[PDB]
């Protein structure tokens, strides 16, 4: 009797059924309740007079006691989706059940490795998110008025904050820190520089990626046509703690000979650096003068102590990679920038890059009179940038009514075209669950889903990518003419949660029952 105290392990045959059929039975509770035309469920207790009827997916799943240990996993997935947004919990559980329903066919009559099935979804979901981006529309129209509406909202976010001293200058910095990105609005694309000895109104916006530390001793302060390499290694005194070692040598000069041999091993790595044809090198650790002197003859400037976030933000602006090792010469993702200029602000030397390759980003340099003005401004600035970024990601919608679900199917079928051997059925199974979403929505409407979904697939396959399902008239019409749209953030949340839920469940060859609390 393994485990014990209500803990047990399911049989490999029953665990696959408990993770699939057992999870579908939980998804079947919210299956018929999906959509505005969905049905209702009954929740009855032992007293039987306390019961209630509701269509809420979060209420039905949490109220019903689940003895299936695999069903408790879907409860945790529902909590992750509820944290993102309070709507769409029903659609995630139903879509996850459709992925597991085809997964039973991806094992029995298929014989495909389960991790490859997940990797088959990771490649299919990537094409699904890309298809939603191409078909994405927005209510941002009349952007000329929308760009003006952002600077007024930024002023409202500055209330109660010490930045309220000047609203016009600070709201312009926050507004230009978003619209000028033309891409991801995450704070990783915005660098904050906190300095002393000035006024808050003297702050300015610079897209040149200003970083505090300098590079080189006798090296020049200007670099033209820079080639940036990103790597992490210790070129100066490795094994940071040498205390306790015993070096057996006949004389002290032989102890330094091993250090010279270590310096000879430095040329092995330095030679691989010169094979890349770079005038600039990035390192998180320090570098001793001898390997740095060899960089002077090769014309390589070394920026040191970039930490990690500073390295990742440098790879995004210059289009580089964070890899710390050299697998093979002339194979890598390299960045570059037009001009590297060293400036001085606040009695400290700074570095201002210029002309980064495909660079889209900004660096907000906050100049305060003390540490209290710098710390409270950065926390309040990110709150103002979060409100401005909320209007960019939200109110941006996509065509609904079965459209977006079928449009993703066409992109996944395109991914199912060029694919390796074992993932051909795994990618195709993902497109089947995408077509089951409008199928179930047509189930509760009272119409024929097999007729509407089949005609919807053949319609979008050749031309007419904007068509969708009309539940009112029971036919196929243009979604742009009917004005049926659904949020893009809701689509990304359901697809991401379905991939995370399938990542844990498909790897299951056995189920460990949780301990009751």
């Amino acid at each position: 009797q393994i485990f014990g105290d209500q803990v047990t392990e399911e049989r490999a045959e029953n665990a696959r059924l408990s993770a699939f059929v057992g999870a579908i039975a939980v998804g079947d509770l919210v299956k018929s309740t999906l959509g505005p035309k969905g049905m209702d469920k009954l929740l009855q207790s032992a007293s039987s007079n306390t019961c209630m009827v509701t269509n809420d997916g979060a209420t039905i799943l949490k109220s019903i006691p689940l003895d299936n240990p695999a069903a408790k996993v879907l409860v945790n997935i529902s909590k992750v989706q509820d944290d993102e947004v309070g709507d769409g919990t029903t659609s995630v559980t139903v879509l996850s059940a459709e992925l597991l329903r085809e997964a039973e066919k991806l094992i029995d009559q298929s014989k495909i490795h389960p991790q490859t099935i997940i990797e088959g979804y990771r490649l299919a979901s990537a094409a699904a998110l890309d298809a939603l981006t191409k078909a994405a529309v927005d209510n941002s129209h009349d952007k000329t008025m929308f760009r003006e509406d952002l600077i007024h909202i930024a002023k409202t976010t500055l209330s109660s904050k010490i930045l309220s001293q000047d609203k016009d200058h600070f709201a312009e910095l926050a507004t230009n820190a978003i619209l000028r990105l033309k891409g991801s609005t995450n704070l990783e694309h915005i660098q904050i520089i906190k300095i002393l000895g000035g006024k808050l109104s003297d702050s300015f916006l610079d897209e040149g990626f200003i970083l505090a530390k300098k590079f080189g001793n006798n090296q020049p302060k200007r670099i033209e046509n820079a080639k940036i390499l990103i790597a992490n290694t210790t070129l100066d005194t490795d094994k940071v703690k040498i205390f306790g070692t015993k070096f057996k040598v006949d004389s002290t000069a032989k102890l330094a000979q091993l250090e010279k041999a270590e310096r000879e091993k430095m040329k092995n790595k330095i030679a691989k650096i010169s094979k890349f044809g770079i005038n600039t090198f990035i390192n998180r650790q320090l570098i001793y003068d001898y390997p740095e002197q060899l960089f002077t003859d090769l014309g390589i400037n070394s920026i040191e102590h970039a930490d990690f976030e500073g390295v990742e933000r440098l790879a995004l602006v210059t289009g580089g990679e964070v890899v710390s090792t050299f697998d093979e010469p002339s194979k890598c993702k390299l960045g570059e920038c037009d001009v590297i200029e060293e400036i001085m602000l606040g009695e400290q030397p700074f570095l201002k890059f210029s002309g980064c390759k495909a660079g889209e980003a900004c660096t907000i340099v906050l100049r305060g009179a003390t540490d209290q003005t710098l710390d409270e401004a950065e926390r309040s600035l990110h709150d103002a940038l979060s409100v401005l970024s909320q209007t960019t990601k939200e109110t941006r919608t996509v065509l609904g009514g079965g459209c977006a679900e079928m449009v993703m199917s066409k992109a996944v079928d395109t991914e199912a075209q060029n694919i390796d051997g074992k993932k051909s059925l795994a990618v195709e199974a993902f497109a089947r669950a995408l077509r089951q979403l409008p199928t179930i929505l047509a189930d509760n409407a009272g119409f024929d889903s097999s007729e509407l979904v089949s005609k919807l697939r053949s319609s979008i396959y050749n031309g007419i990518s904007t068509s969708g399902l009309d539940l009112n008239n029971g036919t196929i019409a243009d979604m742009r003419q009917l004005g049926i749209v659904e949020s893009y953030k809701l689509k990304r949340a359901v697809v991401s949660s379905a991939s995370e839920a399938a990542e844990v469940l498909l790897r299951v060859d056995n189920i460990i029952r949780a301990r009751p609390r």
Binding site: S32, M39, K41, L42, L43, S45, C51, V53, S450
Partner: protein
Amino acid sequence: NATFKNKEKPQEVRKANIIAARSVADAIRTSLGPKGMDKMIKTSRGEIIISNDGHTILKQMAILHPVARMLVEVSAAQDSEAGDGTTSVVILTGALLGAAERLLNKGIHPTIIADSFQSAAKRSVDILLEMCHKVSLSDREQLVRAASTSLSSKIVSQYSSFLAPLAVDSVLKISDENSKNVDLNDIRLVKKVGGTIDDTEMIDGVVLTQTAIKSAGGPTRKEKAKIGLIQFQISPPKPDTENNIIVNDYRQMDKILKEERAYLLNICKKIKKAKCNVLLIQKSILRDAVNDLALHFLSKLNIMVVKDIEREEIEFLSKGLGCKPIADIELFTEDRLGSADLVEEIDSDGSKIVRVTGIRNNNARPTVSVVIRGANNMIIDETERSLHDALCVIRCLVKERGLIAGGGAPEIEISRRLSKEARSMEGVQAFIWQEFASALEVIPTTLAENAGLNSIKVVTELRSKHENGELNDGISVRRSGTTNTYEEHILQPVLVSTSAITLASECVKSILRIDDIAFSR
């Protein structure tokens, strides 16, 4: 061809709930009409009740079936909104469930079935309003005759001539014009043994449920006084710990007496500061209301006291009088006190009812409190319920004006219009319009069965004469045949038939929405 797979089998859950709910409607079906069959229910405690009331049977039936319990809520809204027809709405609900069984056998999804009933219910209301007899609240002739004929089924008969205008004049004051639905809970019927039926008083201000102080010193009457609600209690000192009166000395009798009278005087003094001469204390069985020592203090201050005020009237007195409930003596203020012209105890045999006039409040509106008197206890009881039905029928005219002759006339008129309209529809819905009108014929069919008349024969004679007359053809129990229901003084408001169709359409709609039954604790 290729259609949806239908892997799940939700129909076995819905069909089991429809058949189980249809047996409940068929059981109540025999209770329709005054000649209907009475149903008996024996409670687990051993009590046996007998009555034809649909709302009473479904309440004491202790139905374990969840869908059949919804008929209790539908009958509750039937009595709350319309006030009559709790049996007819259950039959109409079961008639739609019985017709839905043939709809599910044809392979029709319940969404189209539910959406067709809602579309048929909205159009059935317009059919009645166009064929209805238009009446207004400005005409008091039809309001008295409608309430007089509704009381012919009650103990009061000859005295109902004076009872009808009392209910009419009470509604005309609270109805205003555009107020639409007016809460009947603002009308409080106070029943008390003694007197007679012919003795009634409108008393627009308010009426209490209790008597006045019967001890020594009770004023029982006060003029130009203020009224307020007090949740506090006038008592000698009573700390939260255990207290007892132990007097071992001759001098302690005067010490404790003066100590209790001093604490009672401080309570009576704070009441005099706000000049409140009428005190209403919430009824509590824990301690007393006012001590006998404090009764002599308030008698000198000329402050009337009415105690044992029920908790149900606390919310009512805070509305009609415009006052506010006051928990403690510190919360007692003059701003929460109303100004009454005269507060007196009316002397009657075995009654002694206290009334109040001239609430003198702008925020308060014309609430109604009517006194009911009678010698027998069975009189003042049924009289209160009989006036409720008289107020509901008149209130139905306030929300939606017009009245429809009963006896199956509105059920046949809708079926005749939907029969020709069903040919104008297309698709699956066209078959539902014929099944919806077929379920409407269950109500007039039951009226003929419970009356002993031939089921089919009476229904055919009404539809045969329906080509000449319109709304004047119906079932008459008094004549035991087919005749004019308008000349027999049988009248029904339009809101009853409107709510009966609306609630039954939403009920059956919500019935088909449950495809599964799961245990959740």
